[PDB]
Every structure is written in C-alpha cells, then in structure tokens.
Design a protein around this ligand. Structure first.
Ligand code: NA
Length: 264
C-alpha cells in the first residue's frame, strides 16, 4: 500500500527543516508553465498515521492533481514517533516549519504568500488545522516574524479534539495546547472538511460540533459528510475511487470559491 521512504517520481525535493540531524523534505509538484515570478496558490499535504507512522506518498495522487490545476502542490515529510523521538507537539512544530518555509521561499516557488493551503489526513489533518488556528509550538530558532499560519485548510477526517477538558503520554504538552477545538475563534482562515459518518477512529460528532462552533464564530467551515463511510475513505485506491474523486472535486470547488484556483 504505502511505503516509507516514499517514492515520489517527478517531484522536486527540498529540505525545509533540519532538526536532530534529520533533513525533513518537501516533495514539490510544479504545474506546467511555471515560472518563479508566478504568484500561484500552494497546498502542503501532511500524511496521516497517528503521529507515529505514515508516508508522504499518501497524498502523491492529490499533489499531481492540484499541480495539474495550476497549483504548487507539495507533500511534507515530518517527524513521527516510530522513527524519531518526538511527541505530537513536535509534529506540530514541523508542520508549522513547512508552512513558514514555503512562505519564506514564496518568491523562489512562484507562490503567493497569502494563498498557502494546509491539508492532511487524520493526524496530518490535525496538523493542518494546527497551522491555521492553534497558536505557538513553533520551532524556537526560526524567524517568527514570518508567519507559519496557512491561509486555508482542506481536512480529510482530521483529529480535532485532543483534550476532554471542559467536556496524554504522547502529546508533549498539556492536551489543550495541541487541540484545535479548544482554539475556535473569529477571523480564522477558510476550510473544508471531509468526514465519514461511520468513522470509528474519529467520531463524526466531534467534527460536526467543531464546524458548528466554527460557523458561530463567523468562519467559513464546511463539513461534507460521507454517509456510512469509515476512516480513510478518501484515499486513492479505496472503494472504486469514488470518494477520492469526489473529495478532489469538492476541494477544487472550494479553492475556486475562495479565489485560490481558476475555474476549469
Ligand atoms: Na519540476
């Protein structure tokens, strides 16, 4: 199914972070007619795997699709528990480093620094959400005057509640500090969420409750239920790629809606 290290044919490889003698890579898919002077939107995908495993190859098909639509699309590698001595808070710092790196290098990348989308599945969906709405947890030696906050998010059955407060050994902080749900506030970037109603790993009600309170704060937060679908339904190769195909179509219309992508 998925392998690590990933095989990423045609991708440009860039090291976005060096930490603990590990070089963390972005696998970059550029569109046709790309030039550094471009101001294209960008999307950074974070794979899932419980902050313990997974592979950047997971979102390789989606990268190819969005580069084919004119986007600078990339899949980030980030540290995980089965390979590195990290906790969830470290994964968050890596995901923020990736967004900060793309913004910092927006001119070399042909990217609009205000059109960077964070995206991910399950644990990497959590990380994407952290880069839009969870404060701090930044790499301490990076230039914090470059924002690590993404400008939109596309989430594939994300984990969004990590503390049972107001309602742990692997987190690296107090639970609330890594929990997107406990940071809902007005003025947040737009996002779309795909989630299965029969998800036994991340209960759908936790996401519906999230999106409800997100709309109350005035945020554009669309939850697309996939009736009877289970955790992971969206992945390439699952079912007959019906869910993979429709999530791409729904994500495409979301990016055109907010002005990041041109209509087909
Ligand atoms: Na290339």
């Amino acid at each position: 199914r998925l392998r690590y290290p990933p095989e990423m044919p045609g991708a440009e490889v860039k090291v976005y972070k060096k930490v603990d003698n590990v070089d963390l890579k972005l696998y970059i898919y550029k569109p046709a007619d790309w030039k550094p002077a471009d101001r294209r939107s960008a999307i950074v995908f974070f794979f899932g795997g419980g902050w313990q495993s997974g592979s950047p190859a997971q979102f390789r098909p989606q990268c190819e699709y969005f580069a084919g639509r004119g986007m600078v699309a990339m899949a980030a590698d980030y540290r995980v528990g089965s390979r590195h001595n990290v906790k969830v808070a470290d994964c968050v710092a890596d995901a923020k480093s990736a967004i900060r790196w793309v913004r910092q290098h927006a001119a070399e990348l042909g990217v609009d620094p205000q059109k960077i989308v964070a995206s991910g599945g399950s644990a990497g969906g959590h990380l994407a959400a952290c880069t839009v709405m969870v404060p701090d947890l930044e790499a301490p030696e990076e230039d914090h005057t470059i924002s690590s906050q993404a400008n939109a998010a596309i989430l594939f059955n994300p984990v969004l509640i990590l503390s049972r407060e107001g309602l742990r050994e692997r987190l690296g902080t107090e639970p609330k500090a890594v929990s997107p749900y406990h940071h809902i506030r007005a003025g947040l970037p737009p996002m779309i969420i795909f989630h299965g109603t029969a998800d036994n790993t991340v209960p759908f009600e936790t996401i519906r409750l999230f999106a409800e309170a997100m709309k109350k704060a005035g945020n554009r937060c669309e939850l697309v239920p996939f009736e009877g679908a289970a955790h992971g339904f969206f992945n390439f190769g699952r079912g007959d790629n019906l869910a993979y195909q429709k999530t791409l179509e729904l994500a495409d219309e979301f990016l055109v809606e907010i002005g990041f992508l041109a209509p087909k």
